[PDB]
Design a protein around this motif. Structure first.
Motif, short mmCIF file in Angstrom:
data_model
loop_
_atom_site.label_atom_id
_atom_site.label_comp_id
_atom_site.label_asym_id
_atom_site.label_seq_id
_atom_site.Cartn_x
_atom_site.Cartn_y
_atom_site.Cartn_z
N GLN A 223 80.22 -16.36 132.99
CA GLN A 223 80.55 -17.19 131.84
C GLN A 223 79.54 -18.30 131.61
O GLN A 223 79.18 -18.57 130.46
CB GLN A 223 81.95 -17.79 132.00
CG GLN A 223 82.92 -17.35 130.92
CD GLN A 223 82.47 -17.76 129.53
OE1 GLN A 223 82.51 -16.97 128.59
NE2 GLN A 223 82.05 -19.02 129.39
N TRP B 209 79.62 -20.28 137.03
CA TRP B 209 80.86 -19.98 136.33
C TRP B 209 80.93 -18.51 135.96
O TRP B 209 80.02 -17.98 135.33
CB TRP B 209 81.02 -20.84 135.08
CG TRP B 209 81.50 -22.18 135.39
CD1 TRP B 209 82.79 -22.62 135.34
CD2 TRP B 209 80.72 -23.27 135.85
NE1 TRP B 209 82.85 -23.94 135.72
CE2 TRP B 209 81.59 -24.36 136.04
CE3 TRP B 209 79.36 -23.44 136.12
CZ2 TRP B 209 81.15 -25.60 136.49
CZ3 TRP B 209 78.92 -24.67 136.55
CH2 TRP B 209 79.81 -25.73 136.73
N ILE C 167 83.91 -15.18 134.80
CA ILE C 167 85.20 -14.88 134.19
C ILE C 167 85.71 -13.57 134.79
O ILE C 167 84.95 -12.77 135.34
CB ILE C 167 85.11 -14.80 132.64
CG1 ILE C 167 86.44 -15.18 132.00
CG2 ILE C 167 84.63 -13.42 132.18
CD1 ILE C 167 86.46 -15.06 130.49
N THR D 136 88.79 -17.20 134.78
CA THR D 136 87.55 -17.95 134.87
C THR D 136 87.56 -18.83 136.11
O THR D 136 88.60 -19.33 136.55
CB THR D 136 87.34 -18.80 133.62
OG1 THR D 136 86.28 -19.74 133.84
CG2 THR D 136 88.62 -19.55 133.25
N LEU D 137 86.37 -19.01 136.68
CA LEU D 137 86.25 -19.68 137.97
C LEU D 137 84.83 -20.19 138.13
O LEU D 137 83.92 -19.79 137.40
CB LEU D 137 86.60 -18.74 139.12
CG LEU D 137 85.62 -17.58 139.28
CD1 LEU D 137 85.29 -17.37 140.74
CD2 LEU D 137 86.17 -16.30 138.67
N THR D 138 84.65 -21.07 139.10
CA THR D 138 83.34 -21.57 139.47
C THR D 138 83.20 -21.52 140.99
O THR D 138 84.17 -21.70 141.73
CB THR D 138 83.12 -23.00 138.97
OG1 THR D 138 82.05 -23.60 139.71
CG2 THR D 138 84.38 -23.83 139.12
#
Lengths: 242, 63, 34, 52, 34, 34, 34, 63, 63
Positions: free
Chosen positions: B7, B15, B17, B23-25
């Motif tokens: 993302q 980042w 998805i 979604t995450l980091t």
């Protein structure tokens, strides 16, 4: 007559001494330098959000806030019941390292760290609360708290989980439940099964039910590993584990 | 299973998805379920290398 | 030899004249009437 | 995208580029328009916002 | 080989001219009509 | 032996430019209105 | 030996700049809200 | 036992949260229940060690 | 099948409109229906070279 050609070429070279691909490479060089300047050495912090409770106990340690320079955190104050509490007044020591825009009718603080690694504290007095609340604010942590919510032991002038599940948010404290045969979201926290679907439960009978305006349904029941769901004139059966 | 696409990409953090939209980091040292952990984060070339022998790229439709 | 430079310099003058002729763009006007 | 309010979730990320206008119109899950009471901006030199 | 440095001079002036053109971009404008 | 110190001076100028570019911090802005 | 005094002065000037930074204790502001 | 995670780490002092949520602040001379005293605190990278030898660090979820 | 035509050409990426009319931004690394893989893009004169030996250009009706 070739003197004219020589002078034209010399005029061309002295007029435009840069090759176009050299111009393109210099533009890329400028972008590389911009990447070098805008690059942040070390480690960018992880963007997070948090919610804590602040106690009036004298033996309790005061709360602390992770901050970042150039990034504004939003502090929202709620009571024990979660109702908002408007802010009467506040005091900020060391005004150079921190600035704050606060609408006087509101209850939310937009706090931005200006210095690099200097920590301070904030004093907050609410509308109905006699006791001042002091929060220690430290910049430059590896997790940047974008939004901090703070419960308090008192109650403001204003005085649930099933509706949050109906929105889609999982309930707090519950453990993950895996289903078999269907598409439903289930949880168990106090040995009571909580299910969220768009379909309709049939067999065990709902203890309490709710639904939204779009067509999403949430139910709470007791423990049952086997469920029966009928839709569109057809009946199917699903199972869970544990 | 569950598929991941980039993302947003910065140096340091990353980042991604989810296939369901999760979604995450992640950090450089970040143990990611389904893919092990990230061996190395490269900001350029859009490569997210995992210890599961898999490299996350962007969505090809949304590039 | 020495014949190049004065054959070059005048060409530089006309070229430096000609670039800003190529540079500028005259803005349109929209005339509303009734 | 979806907007979440649980503390453990992640805030949304928006890609930008220099010299471009990104339009952000703010709605809900039901698709109704929702007016903005107020907003806070970091680095207004590097980010320009127009808002009726 | 001193013939290099004069061509380095005007190229530096030309490139530094472009590097401030590429540095700045004027901001957007917003207009209206009711 | 002199090139080192003049490039050192040029890098010092660039370093002063970078530190005055990294010292300042823009403030937040707030905007309301019904 | 002759390098000490030039190494003294820049150490002296920067530290005097540094030691004057740890003198400022700025006052706070009590802001009322209603 | 309750696992302690670092909240705030500075030179001199440190802040910890238990896995249940026991907020605490310590220093070099400190008493940690279930883990002994503190022998060395590195403010860089959050490298905090107990006297009995367990390492208290941040969460992997929050890194 | 559907014959594509160019409607926007810049360095870096290009644009393709077919007989259906689907306007698509196309990169060097990008697949394409009916043409395989875009081998190379010439911004000059509107030439899109594919792995299938096909060159997408402008229409003869509208160059």
């Amino acid at each position: 007559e070739v003197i004219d050609k020589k002078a034209f070429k010399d005029m061309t070279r002295n007029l435009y001494p840069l090759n176009p691909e050299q111009v393109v490479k210099l533009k890329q060089i400028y972008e590389t330098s911009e990447y070098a300047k805008a690059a942040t050495p070390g480690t960018p912090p992880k963007p997070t959000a948090t919610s804590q409770f602040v106690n009036l106990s004298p033996g309790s340690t005061p709360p602390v806030i992770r901050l970042s320079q150039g990034f504004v955190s939003s502090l929202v104050f709620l009571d024990s019941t979660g109702a908002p509490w408007p802010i009467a007044a506040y005091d900020l020591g060391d005004p150079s390292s921190f600035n704050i825009q606060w609408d006087k009718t509101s209850n939310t603080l937009m706090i931005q760290a200006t210095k690099l690694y200097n920590y301070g504290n904030l004093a907050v007095r609410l509308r109905g609360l006699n006791t001042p609340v002091m929060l220690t604010l430290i910049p430059g942590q590896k997790a940047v708290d974008y939004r901090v919510d703070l419960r308090v032991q008192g109650y403001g002038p204003n005085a649930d989980l099933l509706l949050h599940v109906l929105e889609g948010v999982p309930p707090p404290g519950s453990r993950r439940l895996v289903v078999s045969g269907g598409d439903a979201r289930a949880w168990l926290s106090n040995e009571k099964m909580y299910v969220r679907t768009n379909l309709t439960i049939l067999s065990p009978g709902w203890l309490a039910s709710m639904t939204s305006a779009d067509g999403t349904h949430a139910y709470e029941m007791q423990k049952s590993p086997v469920l029966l769901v009928s839709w569109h004139g057809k009946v199917m059966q699903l199972k869970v584990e544990g | 299973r569950i598929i991941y696409y980039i993302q947003a990409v910065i140096p340091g953090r990353a980042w991604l998805i989810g296939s369901n939209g999760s979604t995450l980091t992640v950090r450089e040292g970040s143990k990611i379920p389904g893919y092990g952990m990230v061996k190395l984060i490269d900001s350029l070339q859009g490569r997210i290398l995992t210890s599961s022998g898999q490299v996350i790229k962007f969505s090809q439709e949304d590039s | 030899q020495q014949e190049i430079q004065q054959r070059t310099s005048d060409m530089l003058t006309a070229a430096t004249q000609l670039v800003q002729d190529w540079k500028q763009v005259e803005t349109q006007v929209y005339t509303e009437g009734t």
